[PDB]
């Protein structure tokens, strides 16, 4: 079971994930300078230019560790913004999205 055609297959699961987040606020760091107090309550920000950076400096070598930093950008926008506001709904439904394109990932890595 080989390294180099694993990362391949989350690089393109990782552009599947960006292209789910039309708006792309999602796919850098949450502007500290936007929101001062993120860090607050937020222990450890994510977003998939830094998962991107994790890939390459193979820091994902199984697919759940990939999948968990994934639950991260959602989790930290559902703890983060209220229920009420469109970001909130956004993470809802990169939730759904995601996990549907997860779940396909998943199953084409174990053909491997
Ligand atoms: C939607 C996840 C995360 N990203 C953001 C990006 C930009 C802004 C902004 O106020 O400009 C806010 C957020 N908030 C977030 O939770």
Known sequence: ?????????????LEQLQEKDTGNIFSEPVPLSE?????????????????KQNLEAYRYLNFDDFEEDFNLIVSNCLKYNAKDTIFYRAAVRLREQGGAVLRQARRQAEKM
């Open 1 to 13: 079971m080989q390294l180099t055609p694993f990362l391949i297959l989350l690089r393109k699961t």
């Open 35 to 51: 929101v001062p107090d993120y860090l607050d309550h937020i222990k450890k920000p994510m977003d998939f230019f830094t998962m």
